């Protein structure tokens, strides 16, 4: 009873960073030798485990989060590193364990003139606890009851489009990314093989 790995990586349309998607995968035999196929794999690294030993152990419950980010912020997705991609957008814990995978896909997500389909919260009042996502629509303040629908010196719209174009520098082309996270408290084994 195999697992749907080539069904999440082979996804046709991804979610935006700020409303990232999570999917539980369990009760199946998982093999991490088929992942090498797709993409150039600009980055494939693990914290707390080593990939060469990863094909063997059994886990409690493994989750998969997918979203799209710029190509100069990939570094921001790391245990406990500060920036602007893990402050108000989406944040992982400081004791994270698992693996991360990214591949610059500038051939399916960037149109000519700016692909205005993926946005991110630029203005937030306070940073966010690990693994919470915010979809509440609110206008930033400006030393006064925030403009209720408008934009002045401040009072900007929370979400800003990326505008991917097929001519940017490598660090500005989009990058599809997926994150694996799982406990190893040796809980009732649900997946391995």
């Amino acid at each position, epitope marked *: 009873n195999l697992c749907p790995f080539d069904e999440v990586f082979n996804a*046709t349309r991804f979610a935006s960073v700020y409303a990232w998607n999570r*999917k539980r995968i369990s009760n199946c035999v998982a093999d991490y030798s088929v992942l090498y196929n797709f993409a150039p794999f600009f980055a494939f690294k693990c914290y707390g485990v080593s990939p060469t030993k990863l094909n063997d152990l059994c886990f409690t419950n493994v989750y998969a989060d997918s979203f799209v980010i710029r190509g100069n912020e990939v570094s921001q997705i790391a245990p406990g590193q500060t920036g602007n991609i893990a402050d108000y957008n989406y944040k992982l814990p400081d004791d994270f364990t698992g693996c991360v995978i990214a591949w610059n896909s500038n051939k399916l997500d960037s149109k000519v003139g700016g692909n205005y389909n993926y946005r991110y919260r630029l203005f937030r009042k306070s940073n966010l606890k690990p693994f919470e996502r915010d979809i509440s629509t609110e206008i930033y303040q400006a030393g006064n009851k925030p403009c209720n629908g408008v934009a002045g010196v401040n009072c900007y719209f929370p979400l800003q489009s990326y505008g991917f174009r097929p001519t940017y520098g490598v660090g500005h082309q989009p990058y599809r990314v997926v994150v694996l996270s799982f406990e190893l408290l040796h809980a009732p084994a649900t997946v391995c093989g």
Partner: antibody
Amino acid sequence: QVQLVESGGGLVKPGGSLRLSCAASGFMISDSYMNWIRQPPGKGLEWVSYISSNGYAIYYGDSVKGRFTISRDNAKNFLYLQMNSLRVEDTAVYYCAREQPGGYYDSSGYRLDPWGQGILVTVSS
Amino acid sequence: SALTQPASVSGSPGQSITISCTGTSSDVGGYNYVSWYQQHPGKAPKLMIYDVSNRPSGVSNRFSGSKSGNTASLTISGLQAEDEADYYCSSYTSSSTLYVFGTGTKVTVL
């Protein structure tokens, strides 16, 4: 099952404007990527415009750029396309079609599956 | 930017046909997303095949899509009568315009 009925087209004078309404039945138009296809009389098909699910991505045809506004009534659950400042070369039939892989885990190429009945517009004296 | 699709064909029940649909190196070749729709006079064009090898519901196995480099080619077997209809090869691109169409083919049976 799922129908895409049109309404609002017909005869017009050159220079004026008109509005087409695409009514979806059998499913929810508030989460299905849409796009219009125009077909002149006795020719092939041609792309018109496209709305996304977000509502924040809008792509027009290069010829209808500058005019031909598009929007969606998620309250009345329709799609609206207003053709404004029309010319003589736009007489054609119009279809309102929805992209099939509108899910989140499709791993399947795009295809306009649900088609519209289609209505005609004629621009002359 | 449009696909070039041929004029017309003709054959009797039992023969088999093919139809060529060329393109550039950005819409058909390089993306392999081409699809094919059919239209009888007076009906909204209905999906016939997509993803080339992916035949959708109801379709008679008599259709067989294929893509070679830039060219695409359809091959219909078991020449019947309903074949009397237009056939358009469409594709998704990466510059402006997310879909283009072929000139259109008229398939008539003798």
